[PDB]
Amino acid sequence: ATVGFSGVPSDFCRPAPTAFPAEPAGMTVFGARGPRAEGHRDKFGSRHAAVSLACAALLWQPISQAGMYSIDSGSLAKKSFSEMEVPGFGDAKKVPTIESFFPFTKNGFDASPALFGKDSMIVFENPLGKCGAYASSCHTFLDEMGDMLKATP
Amino acid sequence: DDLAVPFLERPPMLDGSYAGDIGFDPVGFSNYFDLRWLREAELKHGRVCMLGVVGFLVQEFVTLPMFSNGVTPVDDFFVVPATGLWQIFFTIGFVEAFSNGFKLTPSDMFADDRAPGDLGFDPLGCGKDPAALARRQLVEVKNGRLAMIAFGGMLHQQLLTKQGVIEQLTNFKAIM
Amino acid sequence: VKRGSQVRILRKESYWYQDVGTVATIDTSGIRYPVVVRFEKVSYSGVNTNNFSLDEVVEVV
Amino acid sequence: MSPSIPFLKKPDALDGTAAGDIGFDPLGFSSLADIKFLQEAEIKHCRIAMLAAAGSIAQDIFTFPGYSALTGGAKMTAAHDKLVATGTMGQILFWVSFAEVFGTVALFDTLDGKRAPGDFKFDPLGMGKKNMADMQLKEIKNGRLAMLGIAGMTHGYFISGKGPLELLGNF
Amino acid sequence: GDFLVHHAIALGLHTTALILVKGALDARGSKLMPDKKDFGYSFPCDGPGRGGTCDISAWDAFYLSMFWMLNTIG
Amino acid sequence: VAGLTPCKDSKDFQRRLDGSVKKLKTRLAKYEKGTPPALALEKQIERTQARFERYGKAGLLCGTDGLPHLITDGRWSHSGEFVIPGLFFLYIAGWIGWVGRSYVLFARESDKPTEKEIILDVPAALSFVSTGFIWPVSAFKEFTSGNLIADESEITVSPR
Amino acid sequence: MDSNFLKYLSTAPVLLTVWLSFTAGLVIEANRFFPDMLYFPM
Amino acid sequence: EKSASVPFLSKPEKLDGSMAGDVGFDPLGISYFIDVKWLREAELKHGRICMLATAGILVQEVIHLPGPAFSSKFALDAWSTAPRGGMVQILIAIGLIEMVSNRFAITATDMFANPNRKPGDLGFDPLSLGANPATRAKYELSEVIHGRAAMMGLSGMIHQMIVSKQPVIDQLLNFKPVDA
Amino acid sequence: EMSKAIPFAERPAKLDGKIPGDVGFDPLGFSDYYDLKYLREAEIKHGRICMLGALGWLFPEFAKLPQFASLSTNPLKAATELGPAGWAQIFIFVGALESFSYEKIYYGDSAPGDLGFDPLRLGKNPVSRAHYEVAEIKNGRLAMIGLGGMIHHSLLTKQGAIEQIMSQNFYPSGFP
Ligand code: CLA
Ligand code: KC2
Ligand SMILES: CC1=C(C#C/C(C)=C/C=C/C(C)=C/C=C/C=C(C)/C=C/C=C(\C)C#CC2=C(C)C[C@@H](O)CC2(C)C)C(C)(C)C[C@H](O)C1
Ligand SMILES: CC1=C(C#C/C(C)=C/C=C/C(C)=C/C=C/C=C(C)/C=C/C=C(\C)C#CC2=C(C)C[C@@H](O)CC2(C)C)C(C)(C)C[C@H](O)C1
Ligand SMILES: CC1=C(C#C/C(C)=C/C=C/C(C)=C/C=C/C=C(C)/C=C/C=C(\C)C#CC2=C(C)C[C@@H](O)CC2(C)C)C(C)(C)C[C@H](O)C1
Ligand SMILES: CC1=CCCC(C)(C)[C@H]1/C=C/C(C)=C/C=C/C(C)=C/C=C/C=C(C)/C=C/C=C(C)/C=C/C1=C(C)CCCC1(C)C
Ligand SMILES: CCCCCCCCCCCCO[C@H]1O[C@H](CO)[C@@H](O[C@H]2O[C@H](CO)[C@@H](O)[C@H](O)[C@H]2O)[C@H](O)[C@H]1O
Ligand code: SF4
């Protein structure tokens, strides 16, 4: 007989390679273990991925709160970069800026150095409330089992 | 001899040949890109920023008769005619092309193996002396880095306070 | 061609024209159609064998 | 066996050479994770918690002028929220992240074995040249005590609304 | 309704053309009777050999299309 | 709107709904309340009303006959009428054909292909059935690798 | 189960009947829970 | 000769005990007709998805992302209330993940073409926790048992949510026995 | 043996990496079936078309010829507005250009995409020539992607690319 779902094309008369690549043992965090070109793990290894991610976060910190901040009025005021007008580009007085790449305000997301901000913050809702596993105001599963065992027909 | 970051190993590609090399490459850009290209970029940034700092200082006090004066040097740019700005841009492009000999890309910029930052510009012949050449290479790179940071600071603080650098220093107001 | 070889038929009137069969025997006596080809596909008449000449068969690779 | 837990066998990944190593790993997290990563994490937590505990106590004792005006007299995590709106926490986080980029580089040097865990070569006053092992044991012990202490202070604040010293004065 | 009857007409035209074109192109020979041009245009059949060869002529294709042409014009 | 009126606002569609509901209610009037026939007819009325309301909101266009008409020209406003339904078909049909062809080849390279075609090897058949979910890229891969299209000189043909 | 009985169940008509009954059930249940779908909803 | 899990039934022939979690449990004999490598890959994928599913159903009842769209303690209601574009994005991302992680070998005919490919091994070990031979077997057994437990738990959670119409924690705290 | 683009798959047989712009990316194997020189020429022509198209999708939003000032900044609306005569003249110009391509494809052999157009003699240096060939291929690819996106964005928003960016209606409301 045939055992189905072998995963081997030659068993099913399907095209396949003849020499399969060997599997090297190397890992990249935020990457995978598999065949790679020579020097790939050294040049773009876990160190590369992690340090690049750290740089990306440090650059996110300015980007998240991107905007022209001015104290000319006597208080710190934020104005979108889109407000600025640029000479020498004909009709387009107002030109794309970083907000084009990162439209936080359009979606109503209050970004911050850390991902979430005051207006847009993770919401923690307490599930327990005032309930108790037994002999509580809330009628729990254990309460149901106790009542059932003490019930009277 | 001393390393910029003692707890990190000296980067492999930084062997001290270039001026100002204190083994500072913690993120290892030299392991990805050609160090000649990186040093050319560093020197170009530093020179542009040295000129930019001197311009920030002069523009706040002295304005050319043909142009109008903005409140701050960053606003002088918006005040000045757009055609004039375009002319400056195209002149800079022509200068770059001619100085690099129409070898403007990483592929061919150093095809003749010219020293990074060496565009043959020495009208007064200041760098004829070798020892003076080395000392002035160190001075150039250090002053260029300091001017890079200083131009960033001047740009951002001028945009914030809406007052020139010296005007801000004379009338310093805390942001909050 | 030799015995036990795959040969493609080149006879237009043949049920197996441009199809591959296996040479079962080649008669050197000097008859008109010496080679004998077996086929897995049966013809309309129900025969899976035929006699062909050396010019009506080409060895396949 | 384990000096700390006599009835449990010494963890395999704990040789005992590291500062503060008393064979305390009943759950075997060292067998799961690289011990260099764990040592770096422990030293980091130790230093951050020491600064945090000293900061809670020192904020109870004294407050810088201007910061009181901006935070409206808020304390601990409420001061955190007020000064997030202020923008000061943003500066602290920016510069701490700038430090932590090179911290990541140093972490990978540790994992490559070139750097000892937690060794940033920062000793301007030269206090560790006499007995570095002794100082390291002191640092680890004080850091563990500070982690527990900052836990206690923060949860006491969550319970009562009062800082460490104010709580102790108004239990 | 016009759409549906139009596509019925398309079916009719295409099937009549199918029968007629097949008859014309296989008139000279097929794999069943590879020497049909020898027998001509309107021979009855080739016998019950080779599975049966009823209606193996191009005339038969005409005869079979005529049913379909009548259907389509209907 | 193309050449007709929206079905949500057509007196003909409303009249058809009314007629259907009235037929069902006349059939219901002769059955006691709560009996299986009454419940069945009530459910029929509810289904009719739901169908008509959903057709109205779907954005279907309706002619003077009061019946929805389909715009199968390519207009994206009416894609759900022919194109998306037809894409689902083409997906399923390519799946079926690809797995069937794969099984034909699998049986071809067997001891008894005819036995495999009358008495199937259902483990391998289910294998192919599973494979059929990426049939577009698989079929194009076969085409470009040359395993799909046979040469003109390797296919039997009748004499001219 | 007997391998001969399993081969019989693998015979073509049995498999065709079972597969088409399964498909008919699929269509019938789809129409039972989502009836009167003259269009893809968009 | 007899299975360990079901004593009266004979040991499944294809289950040789090499795989983690193997107690000879295959009463219906799927392994006879389906390759155990494919079956184990499927088992691990199901168990991993159900581990994540149980964790999500339990966690997103107490903590949510900001916004009315993401504010739903009931998981079946979250399925509908969460932004549909986001859900389609997740679907596309899962498809790309399947493709790349399986290295274009995503079918029953080619999945295990490479001898190096092992059932359930997609090259996922970002922190390299599985490089220790001593703990590797224990980790494998824990993963299989966790997948099984999470599969059962997720099925129970989904259907008890269908019945009660309340979250899992909310149901257990305010239990109301089924009435019609 | 292994593709550069996809490290876990074998290199396509026809794509050996020698030709410009080759990273071994052919997951569906077009190169095995179709003539590689024809494919390269088609890719180069598509890239040139889309480079000009992407430039002209945005240029009217910045400046318009005085004759076509009234025409919409939306490129599709401007296409509708132009009128048969101007479109006929553009078509004749394009066909005259494509007569040379017809001659080079059907009655000549040459490097793919080589129509003899190098008036400024920028391709004489071999190293710069290699960089420029790869740059043309890659900029063409990016322009193809960008212009397809731009066409679909203009379909949806019924506005120009810069106008869409400025108004931030990045997200669709459904089919048009
Ligand atoms: C509920 C609705 C319904 C039903 C019951 C059917 C039923 C049928 N359709 Mg289908 N069809 C439908 C909707 C429906 N269709 C719609 C909405 C469309 C528009 C997209 C089509 C388009 C369509 C086509 C294009 C074809 C059919 C065919 C068929 C018949 C055979 C299918 C077959 O053997 O599949 C099993 C699959 C195979 C045998 C594999 C080969 C054939 C498939 C269809 C190829 C699919 C992939 C291929 C690349 C598509 C290229 C199409 C292009 C050349 C136009 C069958 C009677 C076929 C027919 O009539 O042939 C004479 C056929 O070719 N249908
Ligand atoms: C790198 C800097 C630079 C260089 C090397 C350079 C060289 C030359 C040369 C020789 C090669 C000529 C022949 C020339 C001629 C003119 N230049 Mg020019 N120029 C530069 C910079 C600026 C700026 C900033 C402005 C400007 C202008 C004008 C005007 C028109 C004035 C007017 O409009 O009255 C005329 C006639 C002004 C302008 O256009 O103002 C709208 C203006 O602001 N230029 N310029
Ligand atoms: C690196 C380096 C240097 C350095 C340095 C520096 C800056 C060193 C700084 C060291 C610091 C700040 C150490 C702080 C330790 C704090 C502890 C242990 C707190 C414990 C709290 C407890 C137990 C508590 C508590 C409590 C709880 C739980 C709840 C409360 O209700 C009650 C209570 C308060 C009792 C220098 C500059 C010298 C240079 C040198 O070359 C090297
Ligand atoms: C692999 C790997 C990694 C990893 C990882 C990760 C992310 C691992 C994550 C693992 C997770 C999330 C495991 C979750 C298991 C859940 C189970 C067993 C639930 C059982 C529920 C039951 C029995 C139930 C029930 C119930 C029901 C139905 C009825 C209710 O009335 C009661 C109740 C609620 C009790 C990392 C990223 C670290 C990298 C590393 O290099 C490699
Ligand atoms: C041959 C030759 C010559 C020459 C020449 C010439 C004239 C060469 C001209 C070359 C040109 C015009 C190249 C243009 C490339 C444009 C690209 C790549 C655009 C990409 C857009 C993207 C990615 C985008 C986008 C976007 C999308 C889609 C969505 C938006 O919301 C956002 C955004 C805008 C970002 C000369 C004449 C000198 C002679 C010489 O002897 C040699
Ligand atoms: C004739 C006509 C009719 C109606 C409309 C209109 C009036 C405009 C007029 C003209 C229409 C025209 C010219 C339409 C042209 C459409 C175009 C150019 C569409 C372009 C589509 C491009 C697409 C998908 C590109 C997809 C790219 C993908 C996945 C890339 C993914 C990749 C990634 C992310 C990593 C590396 C691998 C790979 C695969 C490269
Ligand atoms: C970053 C550049 C990447 C370029 C490649 C993008 C290619 C394909 C993009 C497709 C368009 C994005 O898809 C989008 O459509 C949905 C329509 O309901 C949007 O749905 C929602 O989007 C916005 C919030 O983000 C809201 O203002 C809209 O009112 C809402 O419709 C989602 O924003 C997203 O799912
Ligand atoms: S039945 Fe067909 S074959 Fe037999 S004789 Fe009559 S026509 Fe010829």
Automatic annotation (TrEMBL), chain C:
It is found in: Cellular thylakoid membrane; Membrane. Pfam families: PSI_PsaE. One of its GO terms (cellular component) is photosystem I reaction center. InterPro entries: Elect_transpt_acc-like_dom_sf, PSI_PsaE. One of its GO terms (biological process) is photosynthesis. It is a peripheral membrane protein. Its main location: membrane. The keyword tRNA-binding does not apply. Gene3D superfamilies: 2.30.30.50. Keywords: Membrane, Photosynthesis, Photosystem I, Plastid, Thylakoid. Belongs to the PsaE family. Stabilizes the interaction between PsaC and the PSI core, assists the docking of the ferredoxin to PSI and interacts with ferredoxin-NADP oxidoreductase. This is Photosystem I reaction center subunit IV. It comes from Chroomonas placoidea.
TrEMBL record, chain E:
[4Fe-4S] cluster binds at C45, C54. Chlorophyll a 19 binds at H6. The chain crosses the membrane at residues 3-25, 61-74. It is found in: Cellular thylakoid membrane; Membrane. Chlorophyll a 20 binds at H14. Chlorophyll a 18 binds at H7. The PsaA/B heterodimer binds the P700 chlorophyll special pair and subsequent electron acceptors. PSI consists of a core antenna complex that captures photons, and an electron transfer chain that converts photonic excitation into a charge separation. The eukaryotic PSI reaction center is composed of at least 11 subunits. Belongs to the PsaA/PsaB family. This is Photosystem I P700 chlorophyll a apoprotein A2. The chain holds residues 515 to 588 of 734 of the full protein.
From TrEMBL, chain F:
It holds the Pfam family PSI_PsaF. The keyword RNA-binding does not apply. Chlorophyll a binds at D73, W76. Disulfide bonds join C7-C62. Coiled coil: none annotated. The chain crosses the membrane at residues 82-106, 118-138. Keywords: Membrane, Photosynthesis, Photosystem I, Plastid, Signal, Transmembrane, Transmembrane helix. One of its GO terms (biological process) is photosynthesis. One of its GO terms (cellular component) is photosystem I reaction center. It comes from the Eukaryota. InterPro entries: PSI_PsaF, PSI_PsaF_sf. Participates in efficiency of electron transfer from plastocyanin to P700 (or cytochrome c553 in algae and cyanobacteria). This plastocyanin-docking protein contributes to the specific association of plastocyanin to PSI. Belongs to the PsaF family. This is Photosystem I reaction center subunit III. The gene is psaF.
TrEMBL record, chain G:
The chain crosses the membrane at residues 12-34. Keywords: Membrane, Photosynthesis, Photosystem I, Plastid, Thylakoid, Transmembrane, Transmembrane helix. It is found in: Cellular thylakoid membrane; Membrane. GO terms for cellular component: photosystem I; thylakoid membrane. It is a single-pass membrane protein. GO terms for biological process: photosynthesis. Signal peptide: none annotated. InterPro entries: PSI_PsaJ, PSI_PsaJ_sf. May help in the organization of the PsaE and PsaF subunits. NCBIfam families: PRK02733.1 (NF002743). Belongs to the PsaJ family. This is Photosystem I reaction center subunit IX.
